[PDB]
Structure formats: structure tokens, C-alpha cells
Structure 1
Amino acid sequence: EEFVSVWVRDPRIQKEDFWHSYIDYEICIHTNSMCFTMKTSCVRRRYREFVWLRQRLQSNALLVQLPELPSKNLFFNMNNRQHVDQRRQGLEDFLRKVLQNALLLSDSSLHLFLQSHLNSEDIEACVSGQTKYSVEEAIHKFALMNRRFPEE
């Protein structure tokens, strides 16, 4: 019987030796549902991308009540363990709830967010019909790159 499971884990600093470092997380999906292209996926995303995601979803579903995100960057300090953990929990809760909703499950944005390398610009390009590649193509190409699959 159909299930979908999601973990957010493994916080890591990025561009650490630059100005403009940021923290991102790993998002792992495991499902047996027809809804997803891949039954498993791990992808890395940061809070600002979750924000984009939330608002993208909100604007295609005016009547839907999106779940909360955890606290904003302004109130986030990576040296406070409790911060980084609260953020990860919150981002898990957010996705868990989102994924319980079939209308949202039907948004290619969410799928590309979860099962592709594409950033928000390209996601928007892709679901709006303006890229050479389809949504399925992008997802498959991510799995091949990501699983170091040989051949083609």
C-alpha cells in the first residue's frame, strides 16, 4: 500500500572559504508511489530554496494552506546546535505535510525540487515549457549523474 517518506539530514556548510557561506541539507525521499518518477532520491537544498518552493506552490494553489517553515535566516546561527537541528526538523515537517496533499504532489516544481539538481530559475523555466529538456528528462539525468551510472 502506497507510502512516501522523507528525511532531511546532514547539515553542511557551503562556500565556507568565501564571503557568503550558507548551510544546506540533504533531502531524501523513499516512496513506492506512482506519483514520483524515482522511488528514491537524495538532493541537497537550502532554506532560501524551500522559501522559493513554498511560494511557488502557494501561487499555483491559491486556496491551499501551506505548512510553516522554520525560523528565517536572520534568526539563524550555525554555531547554535539547537538552531541547526530545529531547522532540520522544521524542514522535514514542512515536506511531510506538503507531501500529504495530492494537489501539491501534482506540481512539477515540487518534483524537480526533490528529484533534480536544477535551481529555481531552471525549474521555473522547465515547468513553463521553455527548456529543451522535459521534467522527466531532468529527473532521469539527475539520477544517472547522482548514482554515477555508466554508459548511455
Structure 2
Amino acid sequence: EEFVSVWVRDPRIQKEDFWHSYIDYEICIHTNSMAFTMKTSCVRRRYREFVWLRQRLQSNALLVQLPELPSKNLFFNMNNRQHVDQRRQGLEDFLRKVLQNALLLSDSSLHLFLQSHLNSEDIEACVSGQTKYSVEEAIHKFALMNRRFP
């Protein structure tokens, strides 16, 4: 009886004592679908990475209508709670809907985004055949790192 759930939670500042601080969120997937490699995952990503994802998806799916992202950074201010809640909600909604689409669901880009440590650049490398390691290997390796597996 297939299901997929997604939560965006836990807004946290990164590189706070640097110039170039940013915010990121935890993305938690729970699913029983054959579509995913891992039935659970928690991963941390920033808005600019959602933006990358959205555009990568659109580019491989000419005619799909991608859901919206929330307020661009330019109009975001972490000192305003409302901004950080809205950004989180909007990012949850974006993924919820994306996940509802079978065609998108078959994009390994979405999968490494959700169930791996890999950044934009390495995702593109990996799914474009250019890496030592497969998509599965990356996701598995992430899981082990992330669950501190012995």
C-alpha cells in the first residue's frame, strides 16, 4: 500500500562566524516505495540547492510543471521567524508535490539530492556516468556514514 512522506525541519545557520553564512534545513523522507533505495533518510540542504534541483528536473522533463519554490534569498531574513517558517513550509510543499510525479521520481538527481551527501556538481557527474561510483553506491555510503554503521 505505497506511501511517501517528507518533512522539512530544523532550520539552522551554517558558517555563522564566516562571511557567507547561510541557512539550511533537514529533509526527512519516510517511504515504503520500491522507487527509493532507502526507506528512510535525513539530509540537510539549502535553498540554493533546491533551486539547482528544480532546474535540473525541468531540464530533463521539458513539459512538466514544477511546483513553486518559496521567497528567494534576496527577500529572506533569518531574524524574521515568519520567513524561516514559510521557507520551510514552501520547501516541504515543493518536495511533496515533486514526489507525487512518477516521471520526476525516476530522476536519480532527486534521489541523490534526498538520500546522499553529494553536492550539485557531484550529482551531475554521477548521474552523467562520470564518477568511479554508481548512484546506489553513493546512497548506501551516505547511509552508512550517516547511521555510523560499524
TM-score, normalised to structure 2's length? Answer: 1.00
CA displacement, residues 36-73 of structure 1 (integer Å, 9 cap, x when unaligned): 00000000000000000000000000000000000100
Percent of aligned pairs with the same amino acid: 99
Please give the secondary structure, in 2, of the residue aligned with 1:27: strand
Please give the secondary structure, in 1, of the residue aligned with 2:11: strand
**Deviation of 1:20 (Å):** 0.1
- In structure 2, list runs of 5 or more residues that go unmatched: none
**Deviation of 1:92 (Å):** 0.2
Distance 1:71 1:60 in 2: 24
Aligned residues: 150
TM-score, normalised to structure 1's length? Answer: 0.99
Distance 1:30 1:80 in 2: 30
- In structure 1, list runs of 5 or more residues that go unmatched: none
CA RMSD between the two structures? 0.2
Please give the secondary structure, in 2, of the residue aligned with 1:118: coil
CA displacement, residues 66-119 of structure 1 (integer Å, 9 cap, x when unaligned): 000001000000000000000000000000000000000000000000000000
Distance 2:101 2:121 in 1: 24
